[PDB]
Structure 1
Amino acid sequence: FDFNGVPGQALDAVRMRLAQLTHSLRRIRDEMSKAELPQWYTLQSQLNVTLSQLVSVTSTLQHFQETLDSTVVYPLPKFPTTSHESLVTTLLRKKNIPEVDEWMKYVRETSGVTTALLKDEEIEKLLQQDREITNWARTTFRNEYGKHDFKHASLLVRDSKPSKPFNVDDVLKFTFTGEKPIIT
């Protein structure tokens, strides 16, 4: 009633997937330091392959409330405790990119575009769509590969197996008591 219900609808949903990609990375980080021995090439792919999967779910979880969150755009006001020790606040509330943004430029400049405007750009879009449609051609070729198949029970058993000459247990029962083995 004093202050406000600000935001964070799917915030909990971000936090959960934020944690799982933290949790899988953190653990790999701890092992990464015992460079004395690497965990078994199976083991690391199990942890670093579901650790990459964790960031797919964490990647998508961002878009799903993606309209909602950029719109929310919360910047903090707080206890003065936050004001002392300062930076932690600058650090904890700051979004940028690292040296990262740079190979983002290497990539952007790697494309065939940059300042030539709208009409020529719309055309490139139709052209890339045509590339995806020429990719459908993959559907046609996949039909050719023509590989999809399967692995009456009684119909299949005759071909497969006639196994067993008798009952093991009953055989033994006889040897011990003279009770005689009856049809199995």
Structure 2
Amino acid sequence: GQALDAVRMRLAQLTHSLRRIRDEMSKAELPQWYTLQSQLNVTLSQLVSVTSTLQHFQETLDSTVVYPLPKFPTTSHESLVTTLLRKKNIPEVDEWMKYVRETSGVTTALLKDEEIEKLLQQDREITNWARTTFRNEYGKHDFK
């Protein structure tokens, strides 16, 4: 419950920041650019913190089993229950996902040790080489 409580408070403050940026964008007059940048950066880093904390406590969230209250009446609140207990993406995200699979050529249910595995090994090395090259370039010139 502690992990979900932290999840709750952080998500609540994130929603509060979203409400903030909303009611300062809803004005007919746009404020100064700098205030918009500050709000954007704060809210966006807060979203990063949300993602990181959600990532930290995956096990507590997975262990929890959802069950309706005995006192909660489903006969009158079935619409509210079905609003919360359904969780599919917006279609423009699933069609974006399908277009991304098609554009990249990636598909992840039949892959085996032949050509794609030699390509996978031949990719690791470019990253390491580029990292070392830029470390060398940084070391070449004194930046202090």
The TM-score with structure 2 as length reference comes to 0.65
Q: Mark the CA change 1:133 to 1:24 in structure 2 (over 3 Å): closer, same or farther.
A: same
> Which gives a bigger RCO, structure 1 or 2 (Cα 8 Å, sep 6+)?
2
Q: C-alpha separation between the residues in 1 aligned to 2:61 and 2:27? A: 42
Which region of structure 1 is more displaced relative to structure 2, 42-51 or 106-115?
42-51
Alignment root-mean-square deviation, CA: 3.9
1:116-137 deviations in Å (ceiling 9; x for gaps)? 8221589448616734653443
Q: C-alpha separation between the residues in 2 aligned to 1:127 and 1:61? A: 30
Q: How many residues align?
A: 142
Q: Mark the CA change 1:41 to 1:22 in structure 2 (over 3 Å): closer, same or farther.
A: same
- Name the SS for the 2:113 alignment partner: helix
Unmatched 5+ stretches in structure 2: none
Is the CA contact 2:7–2:54 (under 8 Å) kept in the aligned structure 1? Answer: yes
TM-aligned CA deviation for residue 44 of structure 1: 3.0
Q: Mark the CA change 1:47 to 1:107 in structure 2 (over 3 Å): closer, same or farther.
A: same
1:18 paired to 2:11: yes
TM-aligned CA deviation for residue 71 of structure 1: 6.3
Determine what percentage of the aligned residue pairs are the same residue. Answer: 100
1:23-51 deviations in Å (ceiling 9; x for gaps)? 22111011110131234335434444443
Is the CA contact 2:10–2:50 (under 8 Å) kept in the aligned structure 1? Answer: yes
TM-aligned CA deviation for residue 10 of structure 1: 1.5
Unmatched 5+ stretches in structure 1: 1-7, 150-184
Question: In the alignment, which residue of structure 1 is the partner of 2:68?
Answer: 75
Is the CA contact 1:75–1:93 (under 8 Å) kept in the aligned structure 2? Answer: no
The TM-score with structure 1 as length reference comes to 0.54
Richer in helix (by share): 2
